[PDB]
Amino acid sequence: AENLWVTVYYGVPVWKDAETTLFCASDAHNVWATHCCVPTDPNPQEIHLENVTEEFNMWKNNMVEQMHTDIISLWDQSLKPCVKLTPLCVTLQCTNVTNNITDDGELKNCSFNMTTELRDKKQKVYSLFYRLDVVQINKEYRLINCNTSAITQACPKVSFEPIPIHYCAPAGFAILKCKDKKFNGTGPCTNVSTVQCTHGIKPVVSTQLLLNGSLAEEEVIIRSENITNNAKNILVQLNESVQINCTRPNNNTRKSIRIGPGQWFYATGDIIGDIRQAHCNVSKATWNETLGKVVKQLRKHFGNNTIIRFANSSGGDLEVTTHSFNCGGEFFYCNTSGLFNSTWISITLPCRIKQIINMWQRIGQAMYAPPIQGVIRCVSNITGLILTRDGGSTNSTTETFRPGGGDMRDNWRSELYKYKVVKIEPLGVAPTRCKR
């Protein structure tokens, strides 16, 4: 003890939890491609750390906050330079489209008087509309957004097709990952390694059903910050994906009209075929087997032989009641109530379509989505679910779950779950036997 001296070290491989921003890297006219200029590393170097046990908290994972903030920012950045649609907040004169009627009131034929290139004239023009974008004035209609906020047209040449994004640490920082295949929402796991960049995550946005994410390597896992708290949502990761085949089958064309000097508006013109309703096809057996696996896992927290029920969600805006898709730029709101219609102890889902889009439940800044020419097919892999647990249950033998939904950080919370960011702190001290 009497012979101990201070010694100081530099470059010591230790760290503390910390926040910092991350860089966006990619591979391969596309917003994310333009943003995420930095190429990814073809050979990331994963370092296994053997004597490490480390506590991860995906629910307090800052990476989620950044991914969300950055996505909403890029969304606005891409819309900023596009043509404004204020001139369309006029009385709209509408009639029903009965022309090649399907019998599946959804589609209207409407007209309005639009200013021509000169300020002295306006031209009566017409286009087709979906009822979800148009509201009656006590044949007189107005666009819904004009009731509360401004709308901008999305640029027809700008793509939002998802590209897996890898987030990379700044020098002085490291990204740690939990490799434990059974890792639950929080805790001191023993399978820990260090990486420079995350696995790429596509910025896919959906509500209720999570598409094109990661699968559980071993078995379906049910995760929550507090599973016993009915105020929290439950995220479910599947070990196998389920293929879903979606369509917008009506072959149509688009018109382009002049609003002003270099100012163009694109809109749905006539359908050039007959008319049929949009939908998604889910394999029946696969879905029922998948759900049974979820049930087996729910029993772990809800009782070995309890009664588990799946039911349709409560009502509300489509953003929280239907399955949200963005396929080629068209947005769909598919009725999934038939996927949650059972008690445990080729499914066709009809789909609604709309062109006035609000983003991240932010009241204004509405966006208009011009149509796809021809028809569109969309195919996806479901990788997980958002479920909500009913509160108010006094009968302990029955527990009911419904499709849940909410803010999109949480889709990303799941994909970013296994990641944590720390700061490396190079200096430290110890007692020694040596002295100057």
Partner: protein
């Protein structure tokens, strides 16, 4: 690996201190047109530089610059660790260490600055006959 697990035998781990220090330093319109995005990245670069410089300045003022492991002329105080030497090199883990000595961190540093100051003060009179 770049960092070890740092569980024990830090004396061997020390062989990598050079790389850890080395990696502290290293599109045009893709980013230049974007005001917020550009400022965030510059802020990150600047702060990384500041961190680098604070560590180097401290090693300099303490008389440890240029070394990866520095023996000082400041004795170990009992309060720092009441634990004897046998447990620190092998039984302790450096991250575990850091938690316990959080309170005696600044004092270690003030003493190092002062002892270096005294040494230079004395050097002046070794040259002055």
């Amino acid at each position: 690996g770049f960092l070890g697990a740092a569980g024990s035998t830090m004396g061997a781990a020390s062989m990598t201190l050079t790389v850890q220090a080395r990696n502290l330093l290293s599109c045009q319109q893709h980013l230049l047109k974007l005001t917020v995005w550009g400022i965030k990245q510059l802020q990150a670069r600047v702060l990384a530089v500041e961190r680098y410089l604070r560590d180097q300045q401290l090693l300099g003022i303490w008389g440890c610059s240029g070394k990866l492991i520095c023996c000082t002329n400041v004795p170990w105080n009992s309060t720092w660790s009441n634990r004897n030497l046998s447990e620190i090199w092998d039984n302790m883990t450096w991250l575990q260490w850091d938690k316990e000595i959080s309170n005696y961190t600044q004092i270690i540093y003030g003493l190092l600055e002062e002892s270096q100051n005294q040494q230079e003060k004395n050097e002046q009179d070794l040259l002055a006959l």
